[PDB]
Amino acid sequence: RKVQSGNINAAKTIADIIRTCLGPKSMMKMLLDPMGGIVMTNDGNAILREIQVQHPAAKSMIEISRTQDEEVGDGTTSVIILAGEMLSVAEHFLEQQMHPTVVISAYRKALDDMISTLKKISIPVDISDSDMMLNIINSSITTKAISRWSSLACNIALDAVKMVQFEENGRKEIDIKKYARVEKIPGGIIEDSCVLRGVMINKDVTHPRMRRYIKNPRIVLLDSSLEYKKGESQTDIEITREEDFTRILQMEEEYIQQLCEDIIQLKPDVVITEKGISDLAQHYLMRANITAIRRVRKTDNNRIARACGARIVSRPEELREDDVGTGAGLLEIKKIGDEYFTFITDCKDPKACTILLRGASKEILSEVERNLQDAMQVCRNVLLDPQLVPGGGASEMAVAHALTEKSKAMTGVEQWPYRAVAQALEVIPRTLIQNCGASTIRLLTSLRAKHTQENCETWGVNGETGTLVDMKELGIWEPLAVKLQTYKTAVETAVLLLRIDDIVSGH
Amino acid sequence: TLLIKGPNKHTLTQIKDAVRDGLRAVKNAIDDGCVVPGAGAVEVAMAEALIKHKPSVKGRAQLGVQAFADALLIIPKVLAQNSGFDLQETLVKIQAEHSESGQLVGVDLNTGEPMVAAEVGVWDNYCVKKQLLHSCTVIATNILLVDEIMRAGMS
Amino acid sequence: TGETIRSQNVMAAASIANIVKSSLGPVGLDKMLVDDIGDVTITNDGATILKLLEVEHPAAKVLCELAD
Amino acid sequence: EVARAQAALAVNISAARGLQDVLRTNLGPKGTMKMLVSGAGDIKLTKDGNVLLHEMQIQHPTASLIAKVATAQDDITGDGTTSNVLIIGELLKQAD
Amino acid sequence: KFGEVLEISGKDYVQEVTKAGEGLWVILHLYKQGIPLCALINQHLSGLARKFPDVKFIKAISTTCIPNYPDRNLPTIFVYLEGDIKAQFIGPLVFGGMNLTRDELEWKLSESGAIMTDLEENPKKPIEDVLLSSVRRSVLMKR
Amino acid sequence: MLKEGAKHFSGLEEAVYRNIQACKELAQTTRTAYGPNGMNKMVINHLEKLFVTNDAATILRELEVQHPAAKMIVMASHMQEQEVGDG
Ligand SMILES: Nc1ncnc2c1ncn2[C@@H]1O[C@H](COP(=O)(O)OP(=O)(O)O)[C@@H](O)[C@H]1O
Ligand SMILES: Nc1ncnc2c1ncn2[C@@H]1O[C@H](COP(=O)(O)OP(=O)(O)O)[C@@H](O)[C@H]1O
């Protein structure tokens, strides 16, 4: 029994790195470069990403933390600390007789009891009014950021969140990552950011000749199968001589005539094209009562695949009679600013609005981007479950007390690991007290003696002074799903690290 | 055009840098309308106001107030050391002169006697002292919060 | 020679057999395998361990061949 | 890999005291000038604070970072890079 | 004309300066046994050759060029054309350790500049400082 | 230690020592002349002819010094030579 010890040693070594980086009064780490550089930062994720280890358990924990940060976005630091504490309090004390069997059942029972206690303590909330949501967002975002234009940004983010939801059918699916981006354009007053349809068009449309103005037509986008290819599936035609180049014009004319005879009744406009631009064929194409655009990047592809819904397949002609393009859509090339902008309004797949902000340099861009990101993340974490829990260090004490009471009432045989895993939940209050700068023994004793009278479970420790205060007068609340996900991830990591036998090599 | 000549060496660049610093100081002294005296007559009054007339009564705050006030008397000591005199004698002389009179007493670089810098011609700026204090506070703040220094990184 | 290489083969067989010993039955621990690259595979099946394992001994090779 | 002590603050205070003791004899009109020569024997006389801090070979990374931070805040006012490291060093010594 | 990776000895390294035409950007990888970085580089090149068959990739065991070498000849890559050196690389510091996934192709496209497929984006870059960034932000806000 | 790289022996104590000893050693190889006397010195550089001179101008024009205190005087010497005749 030496592999588990070597695994928990590396686990505790990894966990004892970013332990003093929690709370408003956190420390700052510094990393030196081998060439002669030094960078100081207080971000645990940056230190975890810039680290290089060699143990498989450390890499697995890093991957788990990265997955937890990418899936949720809040609560990717205390998981490793809790896992290391549970390991050091369980395996480093209850493995002298070598019995790795009842520990898994004890962990499962403790997880079930913690889930039941956290579910039987939540309070309901209403989502009718908007002032309470804004107040909750402002209270949860007051961490380490500027305070000057946070109200307007949070209001715009809440409006975008309430407007981007449309995929409801019983499962409540919310997607804002690949469904709402950010646009930037300098010039003008900074007090005009709002929401708009948002079309990724800058300098892609090129009209050498002056034609008619676009008012409110019916644009029906097709596919991208008109480049430097050899045809459909045979090599009968190849772009090699000028005769083939001038026959390509007649071929495209015949193709557009076949398309018009097939399924052209709303008169589309521009079409997606990757290759194909000249000074003679483009004139004939424009004269053929059709237009074509080029210069398409990944952003335009994502926009036409999300908002419009354009797919990629080997089928340019003969499509569905009612595929895309259903509704009156205006496309006026406005001259506001200095670049060409399109405002495709009222078309297919609505509720896909983006933001419109006019700042200045790149600092304003970065700050509004991070503000929108954190506000949208907070709104998504809050709207996912209308249940709040008083954080700060009040629910963990009640959970530990309930677990101890259940263990004393059941009077079982495996009560020692249960008590060990129940008493290993007071790490966050101890760390907060240590970061505040006070006694970690007398304060803990007072908090333990206070959480046992009658109806007292909202008394936590202030993160700025170092005294016990009720949560009903401060205003520190956390969502419910985040704590459950954190506990489940910690339990799964402990189970995975506890079920490791021998390690060998292979192919 | 400010045409300058030199004896064909590298001191011409030094003279150009000196005249550029002088022009910058003149431009800084023309944008505002308030000029406070210098010659080490502002740190003494600041320390006397921070030590005596305490804003509040707290030992924890005083433990830092005393350290911040004791670090502002290094400029006159360094000036007296570089001028060629003592360090504590001139200091206590200036202290007694400021406690008996009550005016801005400067430092003399000729005889080491306490004199008034408001009648000779020594002047200074306004925003320069504020910027220096802000920079010193920013530097001294983000230093004591250093926990541990690990050896990692690749880029 | 003679009685030495036989003892060596017996020791090698015992060492290669004392690996899948703690994985018999439905109640067993997991085993991690590395391909000397960076990826790890966690499995508790005896067949998967015997199939994904490096060998260098002739007796062990013929034993793995007979098992397959 | 594993370090849980207070040697970082100690070496920081040591580097700050060294940087304060290195540059401290260039205050007042009665100071001493300095010379710099290394590239093809180019004699360059200087006495300023930013000009010296911008053209030096410091072997300590913390002192180099402190000098860079001090020089980055010199484009605000006229000349304020001098008479700054002494007060910072005194405050750091008092804090230590 | 080339899309596979083969093992050469010493004759190909000399005949490549005469067999190449129209400026063939050949690449040679010094493979070392017992290092996973070489295996990762080979696995990446196995896909990079199929992604762009307009160039040539070859691998050679670090034992031909200067056989009397200690442990300083670190495994790297060498890009050649007709007999000119275009800033060769050495050491794993330029790659980024064992955390390389999509930076080698970006560096190759930046060094070549002829088959750029809209890959002019900037890398992630190392972590920034908390003091210099704050100073720059304060300067931008004051002015 | 903090600024230099074990190249020069400069600090807060070499001023009243090396800056004077360098000039003393530079001037000690010059007091042998100055006056109507026969103290010829041979000069061997690149001509490979072995010629003896008496004036200090050709002696200083061939000697290569690697010290700033010794180089601070050759400039004044050249200035005096360009100004008036002797000296
Ligand atoms: N005003 C406050 N009063 C009490 N506790 C606070 C206060 N502000 C922050 N905290 C506590 O500090 C902790 C900060 O955690 P955080 O570092 O954000 O976790 P993560 O790094 O996983 O996002 C929170 O758990 C919260 O309970
Ligand atoms: N005429 C003067 N008489 C006495 N002290 C002076 C005089 N001019 C400047 N000082 C002193 O020099 C110090 C600043 O000198 P220095 O660091 O060289 O910056 P600056 O060149 O801007 O004066 C001030 O603290 C001031 O007390």
Numbering used by the authors:
A (entry chain C): 20 to 526
B (entry chain F): 373 to 527
C (entry chain A): 13 to 80
D (entry chain F): 12 to 107
E (entry chain Q): 90 to 232
F (entry chain H): 14 to 100
Paper text:
ATP-dependent chaperonin TRiC/CCT partners with cochaperones prefoldin (PFD) and phosducin-like proteins (PhLPs) to facilitate folding of essential eukaryotic proteins. The ring-shaped chaperonin TCP-1 ring complex (TRiC, also called CCT) is a ~1 MDa hetero-oligomeric complex that has a double-chamber architecture, with each octameric ring formed by subunits CCT1-81–3. TRiC-mediated protein folding depends on an ATP-driven conformational cycle, which regulates the opening and closing of a built-in lid over the central chamber of each ring.
The complex between open human TRiC and PhLP2A was generated using purified components and subjected to cryoEM to investigate its structure. We obtained a 3.08 Å resolution consensus map containing PhLP2A-dependent density within the TRiC chamber, positioned close to the equatorial region. The TXD and CTD density allowed the tracing of the backbone based on sidechain densities. Notably, only the apical domains of CCT3 and CCT4 were predicted to form a dimeric complex with H3 of PhLP2A with good prediction scores, in agreement with our cryoEM density maps. Therefore, we built atomic models of the complex between open TRiC and residues 63–232 of PhLP2A (Fig. 1c, d(i)), based on experimental densities as well as predicted CCT3/4 and PhLP2A contacts (Fig. 1d(ii, iii), Supplementary Fig. 3a, b). Overall, PhLP2A binds within the open TRiC chamber in an extended conformation where each of its domains engages distinct subunit-specific sites within the chaperonin. The central PhLP2A TXD domain is encapsulated in the open TRIC chamber where it is constrained through polar and hydrophobic interactions with the equatorial domains of CCT3 and CCT1 (Fig. 2a(iii), b, c, and Supplementary Movie 1). The NTD of PhLP2A can adopt two different orientations, whereby H3 of the NTD contacts the apical regions of either CCT3 or CCT4. While PFD binds primarily to a single site in the apical domain of CCT4, PhLP2A binds in a multivalent manner, with binding sites in both the apical domains of CCT3/4 (which overlaps with that of PFD) and the equatorial domain regions of CCT3/6.
